[PDB]
Amino acid sequence: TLWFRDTYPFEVLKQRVLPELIKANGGQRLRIWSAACSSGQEPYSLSMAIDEFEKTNLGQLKAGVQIVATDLSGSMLTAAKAGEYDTLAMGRGLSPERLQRYFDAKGPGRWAVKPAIRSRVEFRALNLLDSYASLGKFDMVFCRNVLIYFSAEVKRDILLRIHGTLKPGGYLFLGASEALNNLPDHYQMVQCSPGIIYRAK
Amino acid sequence: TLWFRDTYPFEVLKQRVLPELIKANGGQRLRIWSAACSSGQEPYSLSMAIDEFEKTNLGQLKAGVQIVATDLSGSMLTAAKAGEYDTLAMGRGLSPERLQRYFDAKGPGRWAVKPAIRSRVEFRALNLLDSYASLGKFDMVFCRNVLIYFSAEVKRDILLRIHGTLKPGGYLFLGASEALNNLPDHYQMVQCSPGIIYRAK
Amino acid sequence: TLWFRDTYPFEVLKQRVLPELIKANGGQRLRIWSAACSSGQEPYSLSMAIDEFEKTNLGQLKAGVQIVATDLSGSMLTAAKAGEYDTLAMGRGLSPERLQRYFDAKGPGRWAVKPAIRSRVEFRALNLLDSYASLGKFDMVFCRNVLIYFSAEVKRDILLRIHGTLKPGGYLFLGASEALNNLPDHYQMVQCSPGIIYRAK
Amino acid sequence: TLWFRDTYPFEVLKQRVLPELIKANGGQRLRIWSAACSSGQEPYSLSMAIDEFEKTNLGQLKAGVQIVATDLSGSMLTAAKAGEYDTLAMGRGLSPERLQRYFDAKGPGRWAVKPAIRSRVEFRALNLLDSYASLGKFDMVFCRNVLIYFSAEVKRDILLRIHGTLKPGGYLFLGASEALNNLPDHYQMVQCSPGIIYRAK
Numbered sequence: 023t024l025w026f027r028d029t030y031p032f033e034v035l036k037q038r039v040l041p042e043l044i045k046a047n048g049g050q051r052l053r054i055w056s057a058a059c060s061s062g063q064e065p066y067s068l069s070m071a072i073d074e075f076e077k078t079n080l081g082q083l084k085a086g087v088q089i090v091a092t093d094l095s096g097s098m099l100t101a102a103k104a105g106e107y108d109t110l111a112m113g114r115g116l117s118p119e120r121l122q123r124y125f126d127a128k129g130p131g132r133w134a135v136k137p138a139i140r141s142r143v144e145f146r147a148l149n150l151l152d153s154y155a156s157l158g159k160f161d162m163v164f165c166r167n168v169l170i171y172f173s174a175e176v177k178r179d180i181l182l183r184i185h186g187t188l189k190p191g192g193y194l195f196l197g198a199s200e201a202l203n204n205l206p207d208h209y210q211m212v213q214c215s216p217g218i219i220y221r222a223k
Numbered sequence: 224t225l226w227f228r229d230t231y232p233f234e235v236l237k238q239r240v241l242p243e244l245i246k247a248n249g250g251q252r253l254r255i256w257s258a259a260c261s262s263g264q265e266p267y268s269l270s271m272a273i274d275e276f277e278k279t280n281l282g283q284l285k286a287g288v289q290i291v292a293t294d295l296s297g298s299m300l301t302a303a304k305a306g307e308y309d310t311l312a313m314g315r316g317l318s319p320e321r322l323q324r325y326f327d328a329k330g331p332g333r334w335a336v337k338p339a340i341r342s343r344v345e346f347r348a349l350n351l352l353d354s355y356a357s358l359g360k361f362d363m364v365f366c367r368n369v370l371i372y373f374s375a376e377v378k379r380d381i382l383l384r385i386h387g388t389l390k391p392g393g394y395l396f397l398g399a400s401e402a403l404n405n406l407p408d409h410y411q412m413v414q415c416s417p418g419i420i421y422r423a424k
Numbered sequence: 425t426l427w428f429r430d431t432y433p434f435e436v437l438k439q440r441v442l443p444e445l446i447k448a449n450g451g452q453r454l455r456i457w458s459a460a461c462s463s464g465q466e467p468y469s470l471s472m473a474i475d476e477f478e479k480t481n482l483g484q485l486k487a488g489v490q491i492v493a494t495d496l497s498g499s500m501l502t503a504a505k506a507g508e509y510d511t512l513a514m515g516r517g518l519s520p521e522r523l524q525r526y527f528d529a530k531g532p533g534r535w536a537v538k539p540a541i542r543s544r545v546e547f548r549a550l551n552l553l554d555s556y557a558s559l560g561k562f563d564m565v566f567c568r569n570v571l572i573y574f575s576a577e578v579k580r581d582i583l584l585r586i587h588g589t590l591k592p593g594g595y596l597f598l599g600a601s602e603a604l605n606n607l608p609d610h611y612q613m614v615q616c617s618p619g620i621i622y623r624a625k
Numbered sequence: 626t627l628w629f630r631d632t633y634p635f636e637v638l639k640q641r642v643l644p645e646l647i648k649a650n651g652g653q654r655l656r657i658w659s660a661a662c663s664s665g666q667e668p669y670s671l672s673m674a675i676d677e678f679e680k681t682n683l684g685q686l687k688a689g690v691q692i693v694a695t696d697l698s699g700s701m702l703t704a705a706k707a708g709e710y711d712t713l714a715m716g717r718g719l720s721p722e723r724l725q726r727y728f729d730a731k732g733p734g735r736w737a738v739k740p741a742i743r744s745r746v747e748f749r750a751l752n753l754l755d756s757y758a759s760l761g762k763f764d765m766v767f768c769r770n771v772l773i774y775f776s777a778e779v780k781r782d783i784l785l786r787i788h789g790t791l792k793p794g795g796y797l798f799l800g801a802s803e804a805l806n807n808l809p810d811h812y813q814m815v816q817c818s819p820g821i822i823y824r825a826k
């Protein structure tokens with residue numbers, strides 16, 4: 023994993039998706055699910071992106087954005103919760119501007135997300151083969167580079183149940199080279215130039 | 224068995240069956256029979272569906288609904304009235320709104336149906352090959368995915384004796400793939416889009 | 425159901441099956457499964473037959489016989505456990521000698537099987553559709569007039585799994601008008617004149 | 626999952642695999658990996674089968690057997706460590722002899738695997754996608770009914786890295802309906818009649 027992986031998912035979030043969802047709900051609270059969050063780079067990247075949007079658009083989001091980040095419980099999810107990273111992890115995909123604006127040095131070779139970035143993310147233990155019903159409803163779901171490991175039938179079952187967590191017209195973000203197969207009545211492919219997102223029908 | 228199996232019967236119940244039965248009986252007390260209740264998923268799904276109709280149609284049900292769930296009494300019957308279900312039993316069929324409104328999160332990997340939903344259900348021991356005279360009269364009978372195990376002659380006799388327990392105009396719900404042939408003087412087919420239910424003539 | 429139903433199955437047990445099974449195992453413990461025992465007439469008849477064999481052939485049974493009686497849990501299995509019967513049930517198929525030797529009067533119009541006969545019979549709640557592993561191994565299985573109620577697919581699966589409970593060379597007794605005809609690798613029909621039994625291959 | 630699933634893999638272990646490996650290592654310590662142990666039925670069945678082997682082969686195993694049971698972290702892995710099972714779980718695949726010899730009755734409808742059987746099993750949380758280096762070397766690996774969840778490329782990688790955990794000539798047990806077909810340099814299929822296992826080349 024790395025920070026702001028592929029660049030354009032987070033630009034699309036700020037430029038395209040957020041203004042559309044805010045216009046419909048009157049700026050009320052939005053919820054984002056970061057599925058298989060690994061060591062936390064993706065959910066914290068989402069948190070920084072929302073912070074950047076909120077600062078440039080005073081004040082379109084009236085209630086903020088909740089990020090729910092999930093993975094299997096253990097030491098990897100535990101470190102994500104701690105929000106600390108070593109130098110090697112911090113040099114992959116993070117501009118120097120974001121490093122100084124959003125992280126605190128500890129600590130020789132240790133950096134931690136700033137409290138405003140940390141507070142948007144709640145980490146929960148969740149197996150993707152289990153039920154998603156405890157997670158609630160989401161305006162956006164990020165499920166990137168995890169579906170690749172499963173069989174075609176299990177991948178379809180996960181995508182179908184992800185659809186049950188999305189509000190209608192919400193968006194699913196997959197990995198850059200991941201296709202969404204055999205659910206033509208559940209997801210609409212949307213071109214972002216660059217990038218592809220999938221609207222929940 | 225699973226929660227809200229096949230989706231359509233519990234929506235057809237709230238949108239077509241209940242308004243008709245209320246009209247036919249003046250909104251008075253209704254009785255539902257869940258035959259072959261298995262581990263309790265079906266009768267509790269009925270109770271939840273009754274709760275949902277009540278909130279959207281306040282005052283229409285004047286005295287509530289009583290649910291009688293029967294099966295071959297045994298460890299399975301005992302676990303049904305306990306109302307406890309592990310991670311696998313809660314895995315499929317429960318929307319996020321239903322899991323939060325009708326269940327209690329117990330310990331790790333254990334959930335319990337709320338007592339307000341459990342109250343509507345009463346469990347008894349009853350073999351489908353025995354008499355039903357002790358059960359009383361029902362406006363609705365759920366007898367799903369149990370008739371497949373018997374001979375055509377036993378299946379017809381069960382469906383005929385179920386007619387004896389149904390109030391005139393009462394409704395019978397079978398499995399989504401089960402047929403009700405060979406009984407034209409007793410059951411009227413009601414296509415619902417999607418699914419098929421049967422009215423006692 | 426009735427006492428010593430069809431008569432000759434219990435004579436074949438005493439004259440033909442017991443001497444063969446006792447000779448091979450040296451008179452050690454025998455186990456008999458009475459599947460679908462109903463109100464108990466069949467297992468108690470078997471226990472009476474064993475007692476008649478034990479007092480006729482002293483002392484070829486050196487370890488006694490265990491009878492496991494199963495049916496669906498309810499007022500017909502609970503009636504069998506008590507071993508009490510009314511005049512109507514006592515008047516069908518019971519000789520006067522067996523009535524005097526094996527029953528106690530229990531008030532007007534009530535009779536009870538003697539404790540010496542009931543002691544051999546253990547009653548267990550068991551659906552024929554569930555697994556049989558907890559039952560152990562049997563030298564004989566009586567499964568009479570219950571398979572008729574099921575579909576062809578369920579009947580064959582029950583018969584196949586019954587074979588898994590039988591010791592090789594053990595015997596299966598069906599109802600007087602029942603047969604099996606699609607398990608050639610598992611059972612061998614044995615003419616008894618009159619009636620038939622099935623040897624477990 | 627269930628106790629002694631498919632029956633014959635555990636008989637093959639006692640009759641063929643254990644004696645061959647004992648001669649293949651001189652009776653020293655054996656290690657078994659139960660991968661994807663789920664609620665623990667499989668590793669506890671293995672520990673029971675080893676006990677049954679030890680009661681027949683008078684201490685032909687010099688320094689005992691270690692069983693390592695792994696699965697994803699969650700409620701099911703935590704239930705396995707406890708070793709307690711309800712009536713429904715105890716009623717599938719367990720003979721009356723094994724119930725008495727290897728379980729202690731607890732609460733009403735509750736049984737627990739005896740400490741003599743649990744002590745041989747160590748439970749660890751492990752994603753099969755992660756490295757196996759910390760597990761050491763095994764004479765036998767049970768990886769049953771889990772490979773079907775993954776892509777063809779992940780399945781081959783998992784089986785390839787399982788070979789890295791196996792001692793030369795060690796045995797791999799898959800599910801009854803599973804096979805590997807693209808690792809000709811690493812695995813040799815062994816026919817057992819019935820069923821199949823694989824030997825590490």
Ligand SMILES: Nc1ncnc2c1ncn2[C@@H]1O[C@H](CSCC[C@H](N)C(=O)O)[C@@H](O)[C@H]1O
Pocket residue numbers: 023024027057058059060061064093094148149150151165166167168754
């Ligand atoms: N069954 C499962 N349930 C939940 N998470 C799983 C899983 N199997 C694998 N994963 C997780 O999926 C992650 C894929 S790494 C991808 C991280 C992030 N989404 C990104 O795009 O950079 C791993 O961290 C792994 O822990």
Ligand SMILES: Nc1ncnc2c1ncn2[C@@H]1O[C@H](CSCC[C@H](N)C(=O)O)[C@@H](O)[C@H]1O
Pocket residue numbers: 224225228258259260261262265293294295349350351352366367368369372553
């Ligand atoms: N003779 C009989 N009398 C009562 N119940 C029976 C029965 N034979 C089988 N059953 C029950 O019927 C159930 C079928 S599973 C069906 C459960 C539920 N009706 C659903 O559709 O989801 C089994 O659990 C079994 O316990």
Ligand SMILES: Nc1ncnc2c1ncn2[C@@H]1O[C@H](CSCC[C@H](N)C(=O)O)[C@@H](O)[C@H]1O
Pocket residue numbers: 350352425426429459460461462463466494495496500550551552553567568569570573599
């Ligand atoms: N699924 C099932 N599992 C176990 N018993 C069942 C069953 N379905 C029906 N039965 C039982 O089978 C019995 C048939 S009456 C037969 C009784 C006795 N074997 C005789 O020949 O006279 C009934 O008492 C009924 O309770």
Ligand SMILES: Nc1ncnc2c1ncn2[C@@H]1O[C@H](CSCC[C@H](N)C(=O)O)[C@@H](O)[C@H]1O
Pocket residue numbers: 626627630660661662663664667695696697701751752753754768769770771774800
């Ligand atoms: N990525 C993964 N790593 C480890 N275990 C996994 C896994 N994905 C699924 N599993 C586990 O694989 C199990 C399959 S059920 C199989 C249990 C047992 N081996 C038997 O044959 O009966 C499930 O318990 C599931 O938790």
